[PDB]
Symmetry: C2
Subunit: 305 residues, 2 copies
């Protein structure tokens, strides 16, 4: 037993990370088959990023202006193309370590693992959630651009995130692997409003089920509630409204524990209105919303890849 | 910026995990050069674990009784030996994916990454600390025995932990890679007292420095303290005593932030005596003690491997 914030094993992605250099700028790229993917602002200087015209900047670049290095292996760039906010560099060698993979655009509230990289070399791996406002709260220093987020299902890596920017507020923004930003953000060094965030209610409930499975039960209470009653509390505390689709996704955990979803909602209602009184749940003194229902089922059942 | 609980990239260890089967029992092994390492209780049945005589149980086993499977590759066992609480199975093939590696015995309060595995297949990776009482608070389901913990320094994997047991209290115990348990524990299904745990004071201070670096400063206060004064508070709150060696290890973080260690101690004193008043620090409502000073420097400087 025990419950930890657990990332996917990163080895399949490690073998895809490369360094991309264009003039003065170096960041990370993702090498799959004979294409390297990276943020298009690799072609920008310091000053360019205040108001870049990417089409004009890319026109001044030729294939031989992109230096791509896989460890010590040098790749030969034989084509380049911009797709939305990503650059696609065609190289003359297929990555021998390419895993089975898909590109996916995830929904807010879903989770993924980030492999943080600098200069094409991996430094660490952690799990996080796409916030309702399409930011992520990561750990990204200068040079981490191009690091990717992903999920793994048995032998297939689903890439869902490429890191592009740190907002002045310190939170992080990026794109899917077709170069479309999550949220309203643009790849320009300007003030950008993220907009009100909310707590991912269905994830909090999943985590409460995980707590019960692991023996933390003090928050189980005498009350029940209705979906409409609970949603009145959710709005007051800036929680996402709970829908029947969410109730359905929690079905398997309700079945395993014998605790009806609306009874767990009444526990969550009391925690919101009364706090935790200085107690903890799964080692936390706040309500945790970065585990999805599938994440909880995975960890409680030992799913492997 | 941002600060996350970050695990090491697990790819170098993934390539070493194998499945070990002896009769009815299957768990994980670690394949390095031509030796596979695994918990010796792979030779035990359900009933054996109440009071096993491992020497007698191993004598009834021959090389061909150990089935070792690396993915789909079958390894041939050509020798076996017990070392303390680990079994060493000599195989006829050197692991082509063996990384540069060392075996190390870590000290209480140090951190490492765990690659949780089932049936020889990796499922996830997370960071944790060796508690002062030599337990770890992990996520380990049935079949996870033999999963390992490790640190990486550039290209060298330092293996420090092999998982063996879940105590009836739900915390986890294991050995170094020479098979010596951390703490007083034995590989027998019996009640085993872990003994009083304490909070790793030098790690809490490191994490407070990480908070200041990332802009969380509300806990910085007007006071200072002495080492002896602070240690009187530490004992009252079940914190490890702070020594000059700990002060010295925090030197680089004190230098970067300009905050003397004893001034940060006075902040920590006030947090212990007054709580957090419902505020948070780096997203946490409790004092975090699973980051070492080296962990904080690594993440704040982008160290890579």
């Amino acid at each position: 037993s025990g419950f930890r914030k657990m990332a996917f094993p990163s080895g399949k992605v490690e073998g895809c990370m490369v360094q991309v250099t264009c003039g003065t700028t170096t960041l990370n790229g993702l090498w799959l088959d004979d294409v390297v993917y990276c943020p298009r602002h690799v072609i920008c200087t310091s000053e360019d990023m205040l108001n870049p015209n990417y089409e004009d900047l890319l026109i001044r670049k030729s294939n031989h202006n992109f230096l791509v290095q896989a460890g010590n292996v040098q790749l030969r760039v034989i084509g380049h193309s911009m797709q939305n906010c990503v650059l696609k560099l065609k190289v003359d060698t297929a990555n021998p370590k390419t895993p089975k993979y898909k590109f996916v655009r995830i929904q807010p509230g879903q989770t993924f693992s980030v492999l943080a990289c600098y200069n094409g070399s991996p430094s660490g791996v952690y799990q996080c959630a796409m916030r309702p406002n399409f930011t992520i709260k990561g750990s990204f220093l200068n040079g981490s651009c191009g690091s990717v987020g992903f999920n793994i299902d048995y032998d297939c890596v689903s890439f869902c995130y490429m890191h592009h920017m740190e907002l002045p507020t310190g939170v992080h923004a990026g794109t899917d692997l077709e170069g479309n930003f999550y949220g309203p953000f643009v790849d320009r060094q300007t003030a950008q409003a993220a907009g009100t965030d909310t707590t991912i209610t269905v994830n909090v409930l999943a985590w409460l089920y995980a707590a019960v499975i692991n023996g933390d039960r003090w928050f189980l209470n005498r009350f029940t509630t209705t979906l409409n009653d609970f949603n009145l509390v959710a709005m007051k505390y800036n929680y996402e409204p709970l829908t029947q689709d969410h109730v359905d996704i929690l079905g398997p955990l309700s079945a395993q524990t014998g605790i009806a979803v609306l009874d767990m909602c009444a526990s969550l209602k009391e925690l919101l209105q009364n706090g935790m009184n200085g107690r903890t749940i799964l080692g936390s003194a706040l309500l945790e919303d970065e585990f999805t229902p599938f994440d909880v089922v995975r960890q409680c059942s030992g799913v492997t890849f």
